[PDB]
């Protein structure tokens, strides 16, 4: 079939204003992308609904307390001079802007990793020890009260985006990676990986019950190519970004296809970490060069011609103090769409 083409922006670590996201959506539409992936929960949680109240664990937390707790969590992660969080009015505006330009929005609200702000929020809300021991970024899957609170928050974003979006990305990457890269391996040996399987399946059910398709990054799903801790819901679309490395033993793409998962090719050959121009990881020059080397359908370490549903080109703000660099973002988007034009139909 025709394939989707997605531009992904990391607006969780770094605050983006509403008109900046509109300009990105306009560029994506101009260039023939079908979707924009708007990362909003990723270390920071930079979108707050008008009603964040939750009833969980037999307790009620009103909107005032939850919203204020999240705002403090954002400032604890990175008190961005440009802003803290987008509002619901702003997001309604952005979603209408995308709809008028034939662009679907894929939200990302990350858990159980990449949730510094929500962890601090839970601590302010009197939930004891929400973080996994040693981490400031990952929730403890052994802490049922913290996990259930997290699920209740995610559910609120699922409900909101269900009127607008087709896919909801719950993230699921890089467990406890502020400590080291061994988080998934340690969850497996400790036994808690069974509870990660259940958590992912619980979020998948929440998403499906709201009428959307769930998506996650690949690295923690069937880590070590091991299904003996439990099976994952095959309706979880796998955003496949890494084939792993030494001590980071992730399932190959074909493993997921054999189990019936769809693959969204998120090849990290296309990644750009903003501010890494000619030094560091995921450099600008390399991203551009790799857009004329990789096929649109080339998934890291995949057997040739595994089916995919589309591809995702990502810009990250690993260090959110780096400036906006829309000039480079737009060159990356221009180069991606020009090299992959036959898959990205425009007038």
């Amino acid at each position: 079939q025709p394939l989707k083409s997605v531009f992904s922006i990391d607006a969780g670590r770094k605050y983006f204003s509403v008109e900046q996201l509109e300009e990105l959506v306009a560029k994506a539409s101009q260039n023939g992308y079908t979707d924009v992936q708007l990362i909003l929960g990723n270390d920071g949680l930079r979108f707050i609904l008008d009603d964040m109240s939750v009833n969980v664990n037999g307790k009620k937390y009103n909107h005032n307390r939850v919203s204020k707790a999240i705002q403090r969590g954002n400032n604890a992660y990175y008190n961005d001079p440009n802003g803290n969080a987008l509002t619901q009015k702003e997001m309604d505006r952005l979603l209408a802007f995308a709809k008028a330009r034939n662009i679907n929005i894929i939200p990302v609200i990350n858990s159980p990793g990449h949730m510094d702000a929500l962890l601090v929020a839970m601590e302010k809300l009197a939930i004891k020890n929400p973080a996994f021991d040693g981490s400031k970024r990952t929730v403890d899957l052994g802490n049922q009260k913290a996990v259930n609170f997290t699920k209740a928050i995610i559910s609120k974003y699922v409900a909101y985006f269900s009127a607008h979006s087709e896919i909801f990305n719950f993230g699921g990457d890089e467990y406890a990676n502020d400590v080291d890269t061994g988080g998934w391996a340690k969850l497996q040996s400790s036994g808690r990986y069974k509870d990660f399987v259940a958590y992912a399946n619980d979020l998948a059910k929440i998403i499906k019950d709201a009428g959307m398709q769930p998506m996650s990054f690949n690295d923690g799903i069937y880590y070590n190519s091991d299904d003996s801790f439990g099976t994952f819901d095959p309706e979880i679309i796998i955003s496949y970004w890494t084939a792993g490395w030494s001590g980071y033993d992730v399932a190959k793409p074909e493993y997921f296809v054999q189990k019936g998962h769809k693959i969204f090719n998120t090849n990290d050959a296309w990644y750009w970490v903003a501010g890494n121009v000619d030094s560091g990881i995921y450099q600008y020059d390399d991203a551009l060069a790799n857009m004329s080397k990789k096929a649109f359908t080339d998934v890291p370490a995949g057997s040739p011609n595994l089916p995919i549903i589309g591809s995702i080109q990502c810009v990250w703000y690993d260090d959110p103090r780096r400036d906006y660099d829309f000039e480079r973002i737009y060159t990356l988007m221009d180069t991606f769409s020009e090299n992959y034009r036959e898959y990205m139909v425009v007038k």
């Binding site: 025709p2 359908t297 011609n305 036959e342 898959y343």
Partner: peptide, 5 residues
């Protein structure tokens, strides 16, 4: 154009 991969 586009093929059938």
């Amino acid at each position: 154009g586009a093929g059938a991969a």
